[PDB]
Symmetry: D2
Subunit: 317 residues, 4 copies
């Protein structure tokens, strides 16, 4: 039987006897995602070029405005905004959302895949909402996932019930459930990182990559793929298995990717799908943040691959 | 003044006072590309999943391109990645052009929603013989027009002709390709290199050395960034827009490369050269290779001219 | 604040503290409506005409399948089906839906406006579900309305809270709330019926229409509009006021339109908008049906107009 | 074999060995129609209602005006929306004159009634500097005419010397697909279409003609009645199903109500190319010689047997 994102979430929500607030939040976010997809695919671009005589900004505005008007949120953290946005009292609900509204858009000029990343926390205190309510470890996530605007648009949603993938059908503007309760391959054959920084790699990363090209057990060398857009590389990792790395380098000693709205949501999806996500020293989801924009190293993907990296890492202490 | 692909092509065609056959071919191709784009973006996928109670995209894309080109009355020989032999257009529909195309390049990994694309190269039939597979065995130098549609974050058609390279964005709201970048030229030198480094164990020594220079520059310059989507159209388009170098080179296990000369390497080589870039096998310009088999493979290193020249110096150093 | 059909319904649902089942039904119906709209606008018709080398049945299948899979329905009555459809046990919910999946489609060759009409009842007995569960007077309606596939696609939804109109934005597949709590004009200036059959008119219809064209006082004659598609004519009546008639005559003593999925839903929309809908003898919503396909006369619209018709009607009684 | 509007027109153009200018005009017009369709169907209306925190008839006029200007195929443009003829600037001037109604019927678009775009295309006949007078040609001089109907689906009906062809807009690919070729209207229909609200003002010929449709003297079946009130919708039904459409003069409209240049003439041309008829009562619509670009005309059009029967009634009343 066919299923849609809205109906699936309503069915899980009624099952759990929740109040509906998370459903209202996720439905609003889905509306924003469909609007981002439409603009990213350049619907209406003829009007900008004069037929009748910004994208990261628009995407941020869509997510902010839909989440605010959902009555489900109180604190909103975005890659685009220096400080947390505090929802005004009349529109406040109980959830905190950290999101990247158009990840990868710095290279959208070459039509690279881009995406929207989000993580949802429940506000724990009766204190007035503030930026500090977003300073939770990824372990506290109630839901996370991403929309990938690739060759097609897909929303990947991870909750306690598992990871589910929904294809946007542009003919009807509906997210169709196409992959249920997805689990990542135990071990893959693709590794994904920017080898342009080889001169800056930690010795553990250098050794691990060497194992991928010259395997010690005489297995076949891994293929390499690096789109340079996190959502595209991570989604490929989920679908085909393998490993994605953005480790520390000379320009980024704490990594480059952002803990709150890049690393934690992807770590949560990976773990809910039976994969792993590590900084090298600990699970991404266990890092306790002190800055809503702080960076974190991330190595994620199939469990055997991440475990193999951790073995190399531990060898170098 | 706003411009669309159709209007751009009709105006160039009236300027050149051609008969309209190439315009008819290109318009038919654009219609196929719009239909491929619609399917790649999964319009109607709800019906496959039972909303009311089927082909793979690469098969459907081949059918779309084949049928629109046959019915254009502009073509006589059609070479597709999908078909072992050239398709000969039936007599009542024959025009003067030969088209080699890859209808959905990169589709092997479309399960992960990677960018995919359509690549095409257009020749004029040279012989007065009955049309045959031999009419497709022309060097890339003979191309009349070539380019690609990239189904990425948006859909773009890049079209190269004698007048240069022009980029048209598909507006899905109205099904028109809007001219957005005119007479584009590639950067003289870039800062990105693009190849599958997972197979480093098999690299030719010149490739190994060149990549080492990009990561560990001898002149204290900044190391290049690396990008490899693994879908030729996505990687080549990034090379065009940002500059830099793309490599799918020969090695000991693959002395002729992996990519296909007629409908992958030649069209991209032609786009690159019309944009002021370069495209080499290592031994010669891709566009100068004279094919003997419509599916033969060719190595390709292409992109910003300084980057390709630097690669060629390393290649020559290793003989 | 922007509002969508889904958000509007969930909000009314949490206000009313319902279980969510009616929201699940309405979300499912909206998905079917978007899919009908897409097919009605001929998305994909190029494939039927050979680019790569029924509509009423499809519309019925979309509504049937989306409602069955909603888990909110137990008995489904459609203009397209001779008998009531009984939902299989594992998918049964508490609601009964009567619908016309593509009203007006008999003339769709000329691209006339078409529409989907629906009325939703609560199943009243604990008996095994059967056709009798749909034999409720329109007074028992929980929700009713229609989708108009006209120059744009609009969903008009009537419930206890009133009548609200939602415009389908095809770029994102969301029904946008554009007219809230709408009320019909007290008196209009348009009459709508097929005057070609004047020779069969009941004498009261003949006189009433004659008064619209040749007013006895010095008022302006009414304009005439008759699309011949019920959803188009009723929606114009709602928007501009006036009167719509498909009355009884000697050859058709029960009228021609169908009570369960044409007359009752429109009568309910009209009454919730402050309009009226009569058979001539009684309110449409008070007719107790004995046949799921039974016909009913209907005269509906602005109350002053319907009351004036009833004055002429009794005069010939 | 599948066929599209662009491909059909290029093929007819190469057959006739024209210069391509009319094709350039028609392709530009079709681009405008697709953009009007997108806006009429309310794509993007969520942004207008604040999802991120022109009137349709004005936008439609701007789309057609701008695409026709930039086509280099036109010199004088007459629109329902513009008091005076628009003169194309010298560097963009081509040889054709276009009269159009960019969004016919939009006064009631509040009720989502079908709306449409109507157009008629002339060759500029005079060598004078382009002016409003270049649009004052009788409909007989039309080179091409037709309409887009934004109804349950979007359809473009194009009439030329080769006949009338109907193209369905496939929104999935933004392409007009040829679905009805060389269309001909039924010799006689069973539907009449007019606003009977003006019955008190009808001239005796119309009153009698309508009486014949309801109470046939030969005891045949009465005609059904349909009146959307949007000309493109009513005329297209007449083309597809046959029958007759009337908008005669009345007291509010003593010279008729519909506009000669960009409503009556294009529809009259489509009807005649489809084997139908279009009369003012006194003469063929296409034979009226206009003096004012916004002048009105009575019109009775449709199946030839139906219009001929009307004209017989008209003659009887002198
Ligand atoms: O939505 C509701 N209740 C409702 N009542 C009526 C309607 Br209709 S939906 N509750 S909820 O908290 O928002 C929620 C949504 C999803 C949840 C989930 C997913 C996996 O595990 N739990 S929990
Ligand atoms: O299209 C025509 N003639 C026409 N007549 C009327 C119309 Br309308 S189009 N000829 S052509 O050969 O097909 C051609 C198309 C594009 C060309 C080109 C691009 C760059 O440099 N030359 S040449
Ligand atoms: O939807 C719910 N409950 C929910 N809880 C959480 C979420 Br999220 S939805 N209940 S309901 O019965 O389906 C219903 C829907 C609309 C209703 C209505 C409209 C006007 O007057 N009443 S009543
Ligand atoms: O388009 C051309 N020539 C071309 N050459 C190459 C290309 Br490609 S198009 N000429 S034309 O005048 O514009 C014209 C268009 C349609 C016409 C017609 C329809 C019915 O009867 N005549 S005549």
């Amino acid at each position: 039987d066919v299923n849609t994102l809205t109906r699936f979430v309503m069915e899980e929500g009624r099952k759990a006897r929740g109040t509906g607030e998370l459903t209202q939040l996720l439905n609003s976010l889905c509306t924003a995602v469909k609007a981002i997809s439409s603009a990213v695919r350049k619907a209406g671009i003829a009007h900008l070029y004069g037929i009748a005589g910004k994208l990261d900004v628009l995407s941020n505005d869509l997510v902010m405005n839909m989440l605010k008007s959902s009555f489900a949120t109180c604190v909103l953290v975005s890659e685009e905004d220096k400080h947390a946005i505090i929802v005004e009292p009349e529109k406040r609900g109980k959830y905190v959302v950290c999101f990247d509204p158009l990840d990868g858009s710095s290279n959208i000029d070459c039509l690279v895949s881009v995406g929207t990343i989000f993580g949802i926390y429940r506000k724990k205190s009766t204190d007035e909402p503030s930026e500090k309510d977003a300073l939770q470890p990824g372990r506290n996530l109630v839901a996370a996932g991403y929309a990938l605007y690739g060759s097609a648009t897909m929303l990947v949603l991870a909750m306690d019930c598992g990871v589910n993938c929904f294809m946007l059908d542009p003919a009807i503007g509906e997210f169709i459930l196409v992959d249920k309760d997805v689990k990542i391959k135990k071990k893959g054959k693709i590794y994904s990182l920017n080898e342009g920084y080889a001169k800056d790699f930690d010795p553990a990363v250098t050794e691990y990559i060497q194992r991928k090209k010259f395997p010690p057990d005489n297995s076949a060398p891994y293929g390499a793929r690096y789109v340079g857009s996190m959502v595209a590389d991570v989604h490929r990792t989920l679908v085909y298995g393998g490993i994605f790395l953005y480790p520390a380098n000379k320009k980024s000693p704490n990594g480059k990717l952002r803990l709150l709205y890049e690393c934690n949501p992807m770590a949560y999806v990976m773990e809910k799908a039976g994969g792993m996500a590590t900084t090298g020293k600990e699970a991404v989801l266990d890092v306790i943040p002190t800055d809503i924009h702080q960076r974190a190293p991330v190595i994620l993907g199939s469990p055997d691959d991440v475990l193999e990296f951790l073995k190399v890492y531990e060898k170098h202490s």
